[PDB]
Write an enzyme that holds these catalytic residues in place. Structure first.
Site, PDB file in Angstrom:
ATOM      1  CG  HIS A 219      -6.074  -4.470   7.735  1.00 22.82           C
ATOM      2  ND1 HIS A 219      -7.255  -4.021   8.284  1.00 22.82           N
ATOM      3  CD2 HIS A 219      -6.407  -5.072   6.569  1.00 22.82           C
ATOM      4  CE1 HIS A 219      -8.259  -4.334   7.484  1.00 22.82           C
ATOM      5  NE2 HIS A 219      -7.770  -4.973   6.436  1.00 22.82           N
TER       6      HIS A 219
ATOM      7  CG  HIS B 177      -1.985  -1.046   1.196  1.00 22.46           C
ATOM      8  ND1 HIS B 177      -2.967  -1.117   0.233  1.00 22.46           N
ATOM      9  CD2 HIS B 177      -2.199  -2.090   2.032  1.00 22.46           C
ATOM     10  CE1 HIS B 177      -3.741  -2.161   0.474  1.00 22.46           C
ATOM     11  NE2 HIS B 177      -3.297  -2.768   1.559  1.00 22.46           N
TER      12      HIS B 177
HETATM   13  N1  LIG Z   1      -8.988  -4.867  12.270  1.00 22.19           N
HETATM   14  C1  LIG Z   1      -7.719  -5.325  12.391  1.00 22.19           C
HETATM   15  N2  LIG Z   1      -6.985  -5.059  13.491  1.00 22.19           N
HETATM   16  C2  LIG Z   1      -5.723  -5.508  13.625  1.00 22.19           C
HETATM   17  N3  LIG Z   1      -5.082  -6.242  12.703  1.00 22.19           N
HETATM   18  C3  LIG Z   1      -5.703  -6.583  11.553  1.00 22.19           C
HETATM   19  C4  LIG Z   1      -7.084  -6.134  11.323  1.00 22.19           C
HETATM   20  N4  LIG Z   1      -7.447  -6.606  10.117  1.00 22.19           N
HETATM   21  C5  LIG Z   1      -6.388  -7.297   9.619  1.00 22.19           C
HETATM   22  N5  LIG Z   1      -5.348  -7.279  10.476  1.00 22.19           N
HETATM   23  C6  LIG Z   1      -4.050  -7.922  10.261  1.00 22.19           C
HETATM   24  O1  LIG Z   1      -3.534  -7.432   9.040  1.00 22.19           O
HETATM   25  C7  LIG Z   1      -2.894  -8.500   8.299  1.00 22.19           C
HETATM   26  C8  LIG Z   1      -3.535  -8.602   6.937  1.00 22.19           C
HETATM   27  O2  LIG Z   1      -3.916  -7.320   6.445  1.00 22.19           O
HETATM   28  P1  LIG Z   1      -4.263  -7.107   4.906  1.00 22.19           P
HETATM   29  O3  LIG Z   1      -3.229  -7.937   4.183  1.00 22.19           O
HETATM   30  O4  LIG Z   1      -4.122  -5.620   4.674  1.00 22.19           O
HETATM   31  O5  LIG Z   1      -5.672  -7.643   4.806  1.00 22.19           O
HETATM   32  C9  LIG Z   1      -2.986  -9.754   9.166  1.00 22.19           C
HETATM   33  O6  LIG Z   1      -1.776  -9.917   9.903  1.00 22.19           O
HETATM   34  C10 LIG Z   1      -4.136  -9.442  10.123  1.00 22.19           C
HETATM   35  O7  LIG Z   1      -4.040 -10.081  11.379  1.00 22.19           O
END
Ligand SMILES: Nc1ncnc2c1ncn2[C@@H]1O[C@H](COP(=O)(O)O)[C@@H](O)[C@H]1O
Length: 128
Positions: free
Chosen positions: A123, A16
């Site tokens: 995230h 990102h």
């Molecule tokens: N609401 C949230 N709060 C904290 N960590 C998150 C959340 N949603 C996703 N993650 C973490 O973000 C990573 C994946 O994010 P993404 O690849 O951007 O979907 C994983 O390690 C998840 O555990």
């Protein structure tokens, strides 16, 4: 190449963080290679990692998944939205769409291979 396992925050930056707007097809080949499929969509935040990580220290708010470690940027930011238009992996083709939006990111303690800030973005929670 990228190591066997990057941290969530490091993958967040790879996926990102592009402070300078670039070409979607060029900038997606690395991510699709690590995922071994054409990613249907991804948002690129035109900001420094230092800037996006600074959002983690603003007020904590609720996320989509009802966790409470999300933080909203205090100012809109430039973005480009890449969209899978055609092509089979590894030949993924994309169309670009510029945006000027706020973003909300979820932050967590740094893992031991991340920079030692109080919090790091891990995230992309939402665009608004
Ligand atoms: N609401 C949230 N709060 C904290 N960590 C998150 C959340 N949603 C996703 N993650 C973490 O973000 C990573 C994946 O994010 P993404 O690849 O951007 O979907 C994983 O390690 C998840 O555990």
């Amino acid at each position: 190449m990228w190591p066997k396992r990057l941290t969530k925050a490091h993958w967040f930056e790879i996926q990102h963080i592009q402070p300078s707007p670039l070409q979607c097809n060029r900038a997606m080949s690395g991510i699709n290679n690590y995922t071994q499929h054409c990613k249907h969509q991804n948002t690129f935040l035109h900001d420094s990692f230092q800037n996006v990580a600074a959002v983690c220290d603003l007020l904590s708010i609720v996320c989509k998944n009802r966790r409470h470690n999300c933080h909203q940027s205090s100012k809109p930011v430039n973005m480009t939205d890449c969209r899978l238009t055609s092509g089979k992996y590894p030949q993924c083709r994309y169309s670009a769409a510029a945006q000027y939006k706020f973003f909300i990111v979820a932050c967590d303690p740094p893992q031991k291979s991340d920079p030692p800030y109080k919090l790091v973005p891990v995230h992309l929670d939402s665009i608004l």
